[PDB]
Structure 1
């Protein structure tokens, strides 16, 4: 207390001065001259369920951004039988530049991503573009639009300069699911007469005027981009008599923005929670016909955490706790509150290393290329609740879930990290491998 302090009797009178800026008169920035065109790509290979197809993006414009994969499907059953089927159909999509994999997304990632990062009417509109949401009936035909979510598919700021890649081609490889719920299969039962999908891939191209087009064509460029890292693993399945726990190695690299994960029943796409005889939680739920072994497919997702299987979790780095152990509901509700601002469905979890993981601008990362032992430690809920008795579910406790929750045996762990896509002398690839 022998330090110097200031009385500040009129510190603020002293610190004032003239205005710097006025709110009521905007200056708009003059931008470059460009145009946007939607161009169809040629897809090689037969499109159909279970098939692998691909497309090369044609050099029609200078830069590319948005990519939408169109699919045409017909319902194989009535309303309540499908769940985001166009999302399910695109089993995966791989982005290759110069022959090097830059990224790769999975149907489950699209479901996880959406569940975690989209929101409000955007999420609804998304659902409109991937599912039947107006109680459509068997045979109903719709064109679905599945937007891709690669770094260049989200912002013009990361438009991929095909013009700057004169020696390297850019391709998308797409795996179509062998089965799509409510379209060609009802659970495990094939739907006789189901149609094969029609597919079309659209790329929205940016046409640049001469000065900017030339700079892209001739100069080296470094684009800060986001990559998905992913692998599936067995879940330490919980049971009626026990709280299972599991030490999961996190085989990730690069400065990671966040980790995200879900547990699921691989039988039913998007099922991240247990089934129960409560409205929407199972096929026929709330009635005598309810079966807690089959979801109400049209209502597969839920916010009822009582049906989720994670009791608590922590992430360790180099074997040491990165943060204090928190409950599954923390990862499900709070992380998203703080970091995204949307609402995340039960069974979907997030842990961010970033202030704002939902944005493009770096805001703190965890560099797993500098971490020797990254481990996710999970504790599961006890599967003791009789799912066929609503009272058992709705009146339960924090540490328990449905007996049907033991069917959520698959675990998917995803991570998003920042790498650099470098382009020069007509060629390109990633700045870092690992």
Structure 2
């Protein structure tokens, strides 16, 4: 009686929701689709792959569309030997944990707050004086309550043996820049720092790229274990056509253009960290000093094979694809107040920004976007259009956590900040907002950074700003532009 009465208890308001219902929950409807197949094919580079060099590949035409694209990287296992035991000790310098430049830079900021005879003190006494000076510095700069000295003395249990390892997220770090080219024109460009920021914000829970890019979430012991043997990494290249099947790049519609991936590789000296400064780093299998020619890479492409009728239709009329392109503003930082002039073009969906200390970069911690003592490097930021506040001054947590909560699949674990003009900037096919930067005379991101950011040992810290913008790729008569 009650369940039937609920179906009868309808009024004029229910008519807007349920009158002439076009859907039922109790019967499945499905759509028929055209026939297609997927094939994954690995292809060698057209030029030699080496650390610090640029390499390119011309993408083969082994199907009708191009869908997924992965850079397959093979890194050798690492071993170490004392320089005294080596017949040829001359190698490039690597970052070493016995010379922690990031910790030395952090100590340099607290030196003015050390009370007593620091120079003559025992090692254990120096560690105590540094921890007390950190409390005095943080009280003076941040009105922070002092932490117990014992809570600041975190011994990272480093192993009592010699090692070397590939840096955190080495699969991204290796790709300093990649360019997707069609007919000799650059269609899009991606950077190592952008790839990491995109994975932090858009990386879905349970599908994080951890193993596929050599990322351990800053657990040095796991990087050491992984680096003792050969590593095979599959780094996704997040081009517009890899984001949705309807955006797959129509190879058949671009028949008269070569499709090329160009990759600028990281220098070998930046890719490795060692336990001690006096160690030589060896290729684990070959027992020779590691060299720039030990980088191996290939391109793994997923091709789509279409039925003849769909292939012929696509060849006759591929039309236009909405694309997202990436733009970059890269700036050196030498002061706590920084203004970035964002000379980006087109309808910008969103931008990302973050800072890297010089000391973190020099320590080989390339994706450590933290400030001094691991703090947030940004105090506040403001966004100006033509000297008018588009976003008034907001604290770092608003740009990092509130913007990520509103617009992104994930909140960043590092100090990555974002701002979206789009309601759904991760939707590759549905435009949901933008600001046209080609119609603004000035776009300025004004930053107030933490105290002493870009001073002394951190002179030439880096500001990264990346923007995502809409453009249109047109296919006509076997050409793409």
Q: CA deviation at 1:22?
A: 0.2
| Contact 2:165–2:274 (Cα < 8 Å) also in 1 | no
Shift of 1:20: 2.9
- 1:82 correspondence with 2:167: yes
Structure 2 CA distance for aligned equivalents of residues 69 and 246 of structure 1: 35
2:367 corresponds, among 250, 255, 270, to 270
How far residue 258 of structure 1 moved from its aligned partner, in angstroms, is: 0.2
CA–CA distance in 2 between the matches of 1:186 and 1:225?
45
Once the two structures are TM-superposed, the CA of residue 76 in structure 1 deviates from its matched residue by 3.6
Matches within 5 A, 1:124-163: 126-131=209-214, 133=216, 134=222, 136=225, 138-163=227-252
Q: 1:259 to 1:335 in 2, by over 3 A?
A: same
Query: Could you say if the C-alpha distance between residues 130 and 275 of structure 1 is closer, same or farther in structure 2, counting changes exceeding 3 Å?
Result: farther
> Offset of 1:137 from its aligned partner?
5.3
Contact 1:314 1:323 in 2 (8 A): yes
Higher helix share: 2
Distance 1:203 1:14, change over 3 A: closer
CA offsets per residue over residues 256-311 of structure 1, 9 Å max, x none?
A: 100101101343311201364xxxx6xxxxxxxxxxxxxxxxxxxxxxxxx12111
Per the normalisation by structure 1, the TM-score is: 0.78
Confirm or deny that 1:167 pairs with 2:252: no
What is the CA distance between 1:406 and its match in structure 2? 4.2
Q: What's the RMSD between the two structures over aligned residues?
A: 2.6
Alpha-carbon distance in structure 2 between the residues aligned to 1:212 and 1:327 = 52
* Matching residue of 1:20: 22
2:305 is the alignment partner of 1:207: yes
Q: Residue 26 of structure 1 aligns to a residue in which SS? A: coil
Partner of 2:472: 420
Provide the secondary structure at the position in 2 that maps to 1:270.
coil
- Show the counterpart of 2:290: 194
TM-score (norm 2): 0.71
- Give the equivalent residue in structure 2 for 1:216: 314
Hey, what does 2:38 align to over in structure 1? 36
Shift of 1:245: 1.3
In structure 2, C-alpha distance between the alignment counterparts of 1:37 and 1:13, rounded to whole Å: 49
Which residue pairs with 1:110 in the alignment? Answer: 195
| Cα distance, 1:73 vs structure 2 | 1.0
Structure 1 Cα separation of the partners of residues 411 and 349 of structure 2? 19
In structure 2, what is the equivalent of residue 231 of structure 1? 329
1:85·1:180 contact (CA, 8 Å) conserved in 2? Answer: no
The superposition leaves residues 121-160 of structure 1 with CA deviations (integer Å, 9 ceiling, x where unpaired) of 211xx11111164561553211001110001122211111
1:31-430 pair list within 5 angstroms: 31-76=33-78, 78=163, 82-123=167-208, 126-131=209-214, 133=216, 134=222, 136=225, 138-179=227-268, 181=270, 183=272, 191-192=281-282, 193-194=289-290, 196-237=294-335, 244-265=336-357, 266-267=361-362, 268=364, 269-274=366-371, 276=373, 307-360=375-428, 361-383=430-452, 406=458, 409-429=461-481
Count residues in correspondence.
Answer: 366
Cα displacement (A) at 1:32: 1.0
Larger Rg: 2
**C-alpha distance in 2 between matches for 1:14 and 1:203:** 51
User: Does structure 2 conserve the Cα–Cα contact (< 8 Å) formed by 1:69 and 1:147?
Assistant: yes
Name which structure has the greater RCO, CA cutoff 8 Å, separation 6+.
2
Q: What is the Cα deviation at residue 213 of structure 1?
A: 0.1
- 2:215 and 2:318 map into 1 onto residues whose CA distance is 45
Q: Is the 8 A contact 2:167 2:273 kept in 1?
A: no
Q: What secondary structure sits across from 2:268 in the alignment? A: coil
Runs of at least 5 residues in structure 2 that lack an aligned partner in the other structure: 1-10, 80-162, 217-221, 283-288
- Does the 8 A contact of 2:354 with 2:416 survive in 1? yes
Tell me, yes or no, if the aligned pair for 1:247 and 1:378 is still in contact at 8 Å. Answer: yes
Q: Distance in 1 between matches of 2:433 and 2:400?
A: 21
CA distance in 2 between counterparts of 1:153 and 1:18 reads 39
In the alignment, the residues of structure 2 paired with residue 178 and residue 402 of structure 1 have an alpha-carbon distance, to the nearest angstrom, of 24
Cα 1:27–1:83 change in 2 (3 A) is: same
Pairwise CA distance, 1:219: 1.4
Shift of 1:180: 6.2
